[PDB]
Amino acid sequence: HMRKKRKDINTIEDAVKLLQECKKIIVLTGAGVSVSCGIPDFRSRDGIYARLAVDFPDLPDPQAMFDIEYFRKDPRPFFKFAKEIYPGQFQPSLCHKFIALSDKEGKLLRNYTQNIDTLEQVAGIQRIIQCHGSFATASCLICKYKVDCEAVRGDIFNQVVPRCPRCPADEPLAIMKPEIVFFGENLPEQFHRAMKYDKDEVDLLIVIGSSLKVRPVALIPSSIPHEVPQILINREPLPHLHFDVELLGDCDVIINELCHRLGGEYAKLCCNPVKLSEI
Amino acid sequence: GPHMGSQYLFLPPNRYIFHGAEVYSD
Ligand SMILES: Nc1ncnc2c1ncn2[C@@H]1O[C@H](COP(=O)(O)OP(=O)(O)OC[C@H]2O[C@@H](O)[C@H](O)[C@@H]2O)[C@@H](O)[C@H]1O
Ligand SMILES: [Zn+2]
């Protein structure tokens, strides 16, 4: 029995009031929140999958780049590509900063992020779950030996398949896969434990910059109690879900507007242009 | 910020269209 929309929650004014009153908010983010930072998303015309279709045409499809059964067959394309998506030196967006402030004020239950760019950490968001893992560690496909990212980093930027140092040198599949979640893999245990704790505590869900096309993250809106209000902030509507309020557009533009309506420290996040103040 | 960044187009009861919405694309 899927989640219907609440008839009594509709407007941007309603959204502001909820942000004012709610104190256990889940923010579910996807690649859209980093687009303004200079990191393209996955599924848009200028995104990762479109690029992969051009730069790696031999793949059965762009998704195969992040598919565990394909990686097992041939990990060479991924290690040719991985440095392109390795965390760089980008600055967090306004949306990241907004989420960080909510957490600072004690109002953020969790930021479930699908991104591997680590910008939530840079922004000082603490209550993060990296749903789709990260490059922070790597794990041998065969024996599950773990290493820190610095152990495979050199190989990654040299576009070479890093080798397990424990397994036999003649074991073909003894390769160190960074612990980014691929299609066909489990999400980190942290995700499942956090969701079990959070689902009956959340009092507001805000989805920002995601197409919610991948499970189980895409199941979050239907897994929480139906009465919990849901707000979408995204360039595109999500026709497969029933949000209460749909704010469609650039997420920094929309969050900027919400921040000014909230006032207090939220308006202060938007330091450009400069507001009226005494020197 | 962008042209008319603080304005939206409203489709009642609950949809707001801001700068950058994909609906503006061709
Ligand atoms: N500046 C922006 N403001 C608001 N929304 C935006 C912006 N830029 C992009 N978007 C929207 O964000 C969404 C991004 O969707 P995806 O590219 O599909 O990215 P994401 O939802 O995070 O993907 C989930 C998962 O797919 C997997 O392959 C990969 O593992 C990834 O984590 C789209 O709906 C897109 O319109
Ligand atoms: Zn091994």
Contacts of A246 in chain B (CB under 8 A): 14-16
What CATH number labels A1-35+93-131+189-279?
Answer: 3.40.50.1220
Q: Does B24 touch chain A (CB under 8 A)?
A: no
Contacts of B13 in chain A (CB under 8 A): 10-11
Q: Do A250 and B13 touch (CB under 8 A)?
A: no
A99: left (phi over 0), alpha (psi -120 to 50) or beta: alpha
Kindly list the domain boundaries of chain B, sorted by start residue. 1-26
Q: Do A254 and B18 touch (CB under 8 A)?
A: yes
10 Å Cβ neighbour count for A170?
6
First to last CA, chain A: 57
Query: Ligand 1: residues within 6 Å at CB?
Result: A 30-32, 35-36, 41-44, 47, 66, 114, 132, 209-211, 213-214, 234-236, 250-251; B 20, 22
- CATH class given for the domain over A36-92+132-188: alpha beta
Using an 8 Å Cβ cutoff, are A127 and A110 in contact? yes
Reduced to 3 states, what is the DSSP secondary structure of residue A116?
coil
Kindly list the domain boundaries of chain A, sorted by start residue. 1-35+93-131+189-279, 36-92+132-188
Q: Helical H runs in chain A? A: 12-21, 48-55, 68-73, 76-81, 94-104, 119-123, 153-157, 189-198, 220-223, 251-262, 264-269
Q: How far apart are CA A80 and CA A273, in angstroms?
A: 41
Q: How far apart are CA A152 and CA A137, in angstroms?
A: 9
The angstrom resolution of this structure is 1.8
φ and ψ of A124, to 5 deg: 80, 20
Using an 8 Å Cβ cutoff, are A210 and A44 in contact? no
Reduced to 3 states, what is the DSSP secondary structure of residue A273?
coil
The tokens describing A150, both together, are 């610095």
Instruction: List the single residue in B with minimal CA-CA distance to A260.
Output: B6
Experimental method: X-ray
A242 tagged catalytic: no
